[PDB]
Ligand binder design. Structure first.
Ligand SMILES: *[C@@H]1O[C@H](CO)[C@@H](O[C@@H]2O[C@H](CO)[C@@H](O)[C@H](O)[C@H]2NC(C)=O)[C@H](O)[C@H]1NC(C)=O
Lengths: 37, 49
């Protein structure tokens, strides 16, 4: 069942600057305008 | 576990109940009848505890 794929070019891992992303809701509480820390 | 043993060696079945509150919309509730919801009345509301 296992298939070892071959013929793959080896490249160094690249990196990029992660901008202001990844913000999620810490809870399921609705908030209108409070700047909750 | 032997029946000839005295008090202190008998098997005890332990069930630990755990639950979290005020973090998600609950689905499990105790037996309580639901009444009619009035709109403009100073009343004692009870929504999911
Ligand atoms: C894909 O490559 C892995 C890595 O070598 C193979 O896993 C080896 O399998 C042999 C035979 O069972 C073992 O003796 C080795 O110890 C395994 N190595 C590792 C790192 O686990 C695997 O068999 C290969 N798959 C195929 C289909 O060729």
């Amino acid at each position: 069942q296992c298939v070892n794929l071959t013929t793959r070019t080896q490249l160094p891992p690249a990196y990029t600057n992660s901008f202001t992303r990844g913000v999620y809701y810490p809870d399921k509480v609705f908030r209108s305008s409070v700047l909750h820390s | 576990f032997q029946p000839t043993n005295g008090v202190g060696y008998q098997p005890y079945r332990v069930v630990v109940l755990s639950f979290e509150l005020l973090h998600a919309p609950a689905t499990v509730c105790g037996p309580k009848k639901s009444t009619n919801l009035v709109k403009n009345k100073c009343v004692n509301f009870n929504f999911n505890g």
